[PDB]
Symmetry: T
Subunit: 133 residues, 12 copies
């Protein structure tokens, strides 16, 4: 049973400790243990992100999404996620409520199933464990 993990702009740069390739490996391993398949994806392109969301909508597949900056700015992304019928878990590696004020609003949260912030890369793994149950 399949889960999509979609990362947005600047998440390629993870480890400006952990690199993005490692994150894929961690997630892929954790997903194996839980009896899931993780499809992990990254793009700085909104249009590319939207296409992945569209497909997940069509497939009725759940999504773990970390949209980077677009979280606070993209109504379009929000609208594609609003179409998903399966669960959507919004994920942030950092605690967004501990930095600038503008980071404390999210267009995705209201239409998300739930949200995890500030638990680093393990937020992704916790999100997997939710969708497993």
């Amino acid at each position: 049973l399949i889960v999509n993990v979609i990362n947005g702009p600047n998440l390629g740069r993870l480890g400006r400790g952990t690199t993005h390739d490692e994150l894929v490996a961690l997630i892929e391993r954790e997903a194996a243990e839980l009896g899931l398949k993780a499809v992990v994806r990254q793009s700085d392109s909104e249009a590319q992100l939207l296409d992945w969301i569209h497909q997940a909508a069509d497939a009725a597949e759940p999504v773990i999404l970390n949209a980077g900056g677009l979280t606070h700015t993209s109504v379009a992304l929000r609208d594609a996620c609003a179409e998903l019928s399966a669960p959507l878990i919004e994920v942030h590696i950092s605690n967004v409520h501990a930095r600038e004020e503008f980071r404390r609003h999210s267009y995705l949260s209201p239409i998300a199933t739930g949200v995890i912030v500030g638990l680093g890369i393990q937020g992704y793994l916790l999100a997997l464990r939710y969708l497993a149950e």
Copy 2:
């Protein structure tokens, strides 16, 4: 190794499905599996909550906190949690970003290690699994 799970006002009423006593049992079981001890606590009294936080500060013990309504309103609670040296995970059973606008601000988040909302009672279990690692 010990973890405090502190629930605030109105969380006694859980199951206006799951009752609070069951939640304690779920958490206590999940904590056992992870090789932790969970001390779970509930109070409609802010002063009582603050005392539990004080003690966790003194003990250097981590806290999973779901402060109910006081999340959006209590600076005092925020200040007691700010004193905790161990991790603090803020937890909400509901997605607060999907209801009233006033629910989308939290005095605790900025001083928390991280935050989980909208994953129901499993948010508590995911928070345990974080502190385990």
Copy 3:
């Protein structure tokens, strides 16, 4: 048939003309005439107020509530009242719209059946007469 009349912080001090004990007597008499029983209660403690609301929820009993200052400040109180299935009448002795600006917002009103302000202690009696019909 029973009605709960719950007063919050500072309402013990009524008559810094009429004292709170007199208010209880007025209400108890007026309730008798209407063929009701009034249970009147006062506390400066939010937790104590919440317990009385919880019980009224459980009992399916209606509530006339004057929460004093907590009206403008307590999300927790709002959430306990939101659980009441019977009518909730919000009451204020003073006209709150005639004093400071901060007094002109109420967390309770939106989840209340209705609201009476500025008719003094008779607001309580008018509220009784509503619930009678």
Copy 4:
């Protein structure tokens, strides 16, 4: 002893259960019982409303006012009511704090003796009973 009951724009349409003519009858009956005379009036015209308020000012007669939409919008109406020396009870059939945000501000409340919202057509009768005492 006389009481004016003034309804504003759209209150002719009551019962898009109860019709406005019935409301007049209810009020007229309830006023009889209390040993008052009710003069009930309705207009979609602000100028017409203002004239009725002017007269009540001049007569020193009290007013129960439900100004419909003009409550949230008319400074002029507010200024005519500010001139009334007798009591002014502001009335709303609906709970205005339960609908749109713009409905939660009133130019009349601060200059009113008091306010009743969300108790339906009985709000008018409760207001009568106040002015009786």
Copy 5:
């Protein structure tokens, strides 16, 4: 099949090119072609406007409305239109989003079927063509 075209304050003054009488003629002709009857009406009086809306509510007839200034200011007008069961098309000759900031909010839009701004007098004709289909 009948359509009401209601213009509010200051629309008598059209052509401080086209006069209001001409507008009636254009609309009446265009409506003929579409196999409708247009009843066109203008008033600087809110109460008069409300009466026309009431009637359209009662008749279950659709309305094309250009309320002039009252668009940004009248809650009462909004409430009468909210009662209409047939379509309501909000029309503005000018682009309101190109002038003052206060012109960019409308109490009618949220309760309207749809809105046309900045297409001049042809906005009325386009609105007719909608209701035809």
Copy 6:
């Protein structure tokens, strides 16, 4: 040479010292001395006010306007005055900046030639003396 003096809602009530009839006489006398004719007018009706403004537009006659409450609320009135080609002097008997905050904004001022507030009934006479020169 002619000047229109237009008063809005509640200005009939002047002298809840000076009555409105006296004001007309003062203005008419002062206008005589200056070699003008004053046409003074009062209405609680916005539509009636707008008609007087329309006519002054058409006549190219100047206007001294005290719109009462409608100053802070009417976009429609603003739009009729915006059409006047001759001078428009906005007048207020009271100092509006000394009372409520909502009184300190005016839709008319930006489109007026100028404004006089807080000089009582003499504001009208000063406005006449301007238009004389």
Copy 7:
């Protein structure tokens, strides 16, 4: 004579009744009848949208634009449209004033010739009929 119809992010998904391909056909047919050619285009890519706008600027060709989410968010898109010398009609299938508050602001409207919202796919056809005349 040519008209560009440009749709933005998520409009490929139309018919999560009508599909986007059908919309192209409707528009192409309606344009034929009016003696126009419609060039219809869709992209989730802002840069791709901007290129189409640039070209329309250069060609001096008019544009009917439905930018989806980017309407409320893109200053860049606004700036490309500001360069168009021919008419620009802003189109929205839904009534944006009936959903979230953030949907009620548009960077495009002020620089657009005019705007149509809430008339579904026929908004595009009405926009064509404008540009025909």
Copy 8:
């Protein structure tokens, strides 16, 4: 009987038609006719302005004040004028409500007897004529 006319920063530059020296002459002449003495003064220095206000306070002499930019910015100036026991007329040559938004707030107005804006240099003469009566 004496009147102080105090101009603030940038009013030396009048006539970047009329020069400031001419303004003094106009005022001095008009004051003569009214049987007053005008003391006219100008300074770009706030401290210098405050000293003139202090003196007028002490003397119990009235003041016509045009504080230029300091109107919208100086609490200190406001506080010196608040001490004046005689009338204070606030004057602006331009209509401040017709330019930038920041120009539409004044710290002086609330503590002024009254205000004249947009009647050019004659505003000063009208203000004299007030204080004469």
Copy 9:
């Protein structure tokens, strides 16, 4: 002659240098020197704080109050202090204007005699010295 020193939530934790017990001793000593008696008190309970304020009201005794977080949040506390007839000095150990923005508003200040912030524990002693004179 007696002075009440009331500390609110989290002030038990002073010295997460100086402990609260030491603070009591400092104050008690300083009060002795000034020929006063200091009654010092601390509670994390709002209701408990309110009771101490009530008593001081009744006794007509002055109060030095440091309400911790409740300063920025409690209308109820504000209302109890508003009843005190003797002086009320509001005290804060830290400079509240140097931390978060939310700390820079206080419900108590407007109804306090005066306020001391940022002078550490000596703020209490300075407040004593005021009430001595």
Copy 10:
């Protein structure tokens, strides 16, 4: 050991009871008792105030500052005080939180060591006693 006491605009006018000269004497006496020298200074000139602050910066001398109106308005003054290495005590004779809303913000507080408001002229003496210890 030296302390600077700097008063700003309008503080010359103290005693529109106590005069400024008396205040200097009180402070000079109290400073003597504490084994300090007080240099007290007053100016309506910001530039003059800034020079005194500059000098105190250079001297590394502490400052007790009551800037009058400039407190709420001067960023420049704030920047000179930010340079002081010794303590800065901000002083206000009145309770600023009890008057207008604009008086409740201060550019100085965040960069001050601490603040005293509403304790009249004794605020200066209390501030001296701080710097003594």
Copy 11:
């Protein structure tokens, strides 16, 4: 020694006088004179811009950035620039503070070394001259 000059959306259109190709030539020449190499780049694609920023981060190369509309809207772009270790000069050809209000906020400025606006294409050359020294 290398400098990156990155232009965002709509800057291809420069010269709707100077064309973008000319700008490249000007910059390339000016950079030669200063003993630098300029790499100039333009894209309407955010993802493409981000890639260029990433590379400059990795290379530790400085950047002169004119992000067009994305300046006021992109948090993602801000986050990529925040990673640059070398200087970042933000450039705008126009004075953004002289047009719409929304243009007067920039997500880039706070994380930029510095900013140049309103000096036209020479802003780029001035920025080069900075990085030279």
Copy 12:
């Protein structure tokens, strides 16, 4: 050919590295090289600054202005600069967008030719080089 360089409050204190006298020398040298004369000036006095601006207006000479704190606060200064016919370059040594929020608004920018912030003392030299071309 002459350029005025005007610095405001607190810029005398430069080098609480570089002193103001050095800055004058740098500018004077750089201006020589460019075939200009620099007249550099500094004052903590607004009135003194305004006089220098007036003169530059009269002379039709350009100005490089760094008004310190007055940038964010002085409407008067803004109005004197608005009169300058030659270019006005606004200069800030620091990046104002990287410190407090209040520093991110400027009354001068909208009426300036352009703005340079965060490039230290070289901002002045870059501004010279602009005016040279």
